[PDB]
Structures are given as C-alpha cells and as structure tokens.
Amino acid sequence: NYCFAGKTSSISDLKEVPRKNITLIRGLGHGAFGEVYEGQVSPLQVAVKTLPEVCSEQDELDFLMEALIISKFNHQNIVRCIGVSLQSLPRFILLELMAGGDLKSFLRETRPRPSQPSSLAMLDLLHVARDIACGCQYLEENHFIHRDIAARNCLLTCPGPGRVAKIGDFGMAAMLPVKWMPPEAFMEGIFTSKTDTWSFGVLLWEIFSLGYMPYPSKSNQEVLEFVTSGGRMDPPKNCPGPVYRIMTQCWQHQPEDRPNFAIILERIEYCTQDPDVINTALPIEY
C-alpha cells in the first residue's frame, strides 16, 4: 500500500522473522498500541513493538503501516527495522534497540546535579541536535513529512559518550501535539517540510532546557493563541545566543522564512565550532 523514495511496497516486503526465534526479555514502556519490550532474535538485540490481540481493523492497519514506513528508510539517524512477526499473535515489529532510551528521559535523568556535575556539556546537546537535524534532512530530501518531531520520539543508542540520536517513532506521519506545531498547521491543517522545521526548533528548546515541557505553564489553547499572536518561548536557561538564534529562525511565522534542514545543519555545525558556545556551562540543578 505504501510508496516511498519512488518505490512502492507492501506487507509482502517486510522481513518476517519466525516467531520461535524471538524471545521477550523485559518491558520498556508503552507506545501507541501497546507495551514495547526488550527482546532477542536468532544473537540479535531488538525492541519489540506489539499489537494487542483485541484491537480494531484500523489498529491492524496503522500497525502494519508503521512497519512499511520505518522499513523503507535507510539512514543512520533513523532507527532500523530488523523485521516483523505478523503471522503469529500478538503481532511484532522488531526495531533497533536504543540502549540510551528516549531523549526526553535521557535529558531529565542526566541533568547535571551537584553529584553528577559533568553528566553533560553543551557539546553533547549540539551533537544530539546535529544527529536529529541530519535525520530530518534525509526526510526532507525524500519529501517525507514527519509531523511530530519531539523529544519523546527520539532515542539514543547508548547512555554514555559516543551516543547517537535517532528519530524512533513515525506515528503521526486534544491529542494533537499543538505545542510542537506552526500556525499554518493547527489552523489550516497545512503541512510541508517547513513544518518539521518549526517542530525541530521546539525540539531544540527541549534539548537545551534538558527535557522541560515546552511553553511551561500554558495549556494547548493558550499556546495556540500565544503562538499565533507572535509569542515565542524564552531561551532555555543558559542557552547561548547562537543556539537560541536557530530556535527563533525555525519559528518564523512565514513558512518561506524558516530555514530548510541543510541550513539548520550548517548552523548547528558553526555553533559546534564556536568556543563561546561549547565552553558554556549547563545549569546544575539542585
């Protein structure tokens, strides 16, 4: 059913892994349609999205569709799909296991504290953002629009240095993520790649505040009105001007005025080269 990079594909095109080759190990949390587990294949370590046996037809198709989409990507900042197990119940989608967990947790559990005073530096944050901008770039030059670029949808391979960040859910592509959306998206329902640009800008704020909820204190409707009136979040605490400057460029009201990801990428690179930026200390939370 699904078309990408030119090629058209279908369920026949997914790697069916024999169920007997799949061991579940522990649960990791819950995604859209159910608990995700840590698991194995034969020795291969994976995450296992599962579909609850008692679910709707549309549930069946959303689940299959997530597999097709994520299976056609080939980029190192987009989580890999090992295969599926769709011919035994409950259904499985096997994905690259990201030991560092999701980005919003990582940021929160790694905030520098008086004991972990050097858990992270500004340069770790810029690499996480480089990683994701690189993924979003790959999507843009393939005309794919993600629609939900947010910290909760990103993942890290490992906790320590050497960690690579990747876009790890494609569920979108009052439940609406208003706080990540540009005016023309929540008003006119128009999406283009300039809307992932806006979202990325908000992700950048999440990254540099260390996992805070955007527009702290505002409900969905207040954000919608704030944002359409020209309102914009302040710099996260300690955020360097040049990094904030990328945020406010991503949030330009006119889609045509926002940068594309090649340009965002250049500017994260320049930030990364600037001693004034990366010699900046993160807030040690007490």
Ligand X SMILES: COc1cc(N2CCC(N3CCN(C)CC3)CC2)ccc1Nc1ncc(Cl)c(Nc2ccccc2S(=O)(=O)C(C)C)n1
Give the separation between CA 253 and CA 223, rounded to whole angstroms. Answer: 14
Q: Which of 95, 136, 204, 271 binds ligand X (CB under 6 A)?
A: 95
Token couple for 234: 């302040």
61 interacts with ligand X by CB under 6 A? no
> CA 41 → CA 22, 28, 48, 97, 127, distances in Å?
5, 17, 10, 12, 31
Give the separation between CA 87 and CA 97, rounded to whole angstroms. Answer: 22
**SS3 state at 38:** strand
34 interacts with ligand X by CB under 6 A? no
Give the separation between CA 222 and CA 231, rounded to whole angstroms. Answer: 10
155 interacts with ligand X by CB under 6 A? yes
Region binding ligand X by CB under 6 A among candidate stretches 92-100, 174-182, 237-245, 256-264: 92-100
179 is in an annotated binding site: no
196 is in an annotated binding site: no
101 interacts with ligand X by CB under 6 A? yes
Contact letters for ligand X, residues 9-28 (x by CB under 6 A) = -------------------x
52 interacts with ligand X by CB under 6 A? no
Phi, psi of 219 (to 5 degrees): -75, 170
The catalytic position among 148, 196, 274, 276 is 148
Region binding ligand X by CB under 6 A among candidate stretches 7-15, 97-105, 125-133, 205-213: 97-105
Longest dimension (CA), the chain: 56
The H-assigned helical ranges of the chain are: 57-72, 103-110, 122-140, 183-186, 193-209, 220-228, 241-250, 261-273, 275-278
Q: Which of 98, 126, 133, 136 binds ligand X (CB under 6 A)?
A: 98
Q: Is 62 annotated as catalytic?
A: no
The H-assigned helical ranges of 151-192 are: 183-186
Residue 273 CB, shortest distance to ligand X, in Å, is 31
29 interacts with ligand X by CB under 6 A? yes
Binding residues for ATP, as ranges, are: 30, 49, 96-98, 169
Residues that bind ligand X (CB under 6 A): 28-31, 36, 38, 47, 79, 95, 97-99, 101-102, 105, 152-153, 155, 168-169
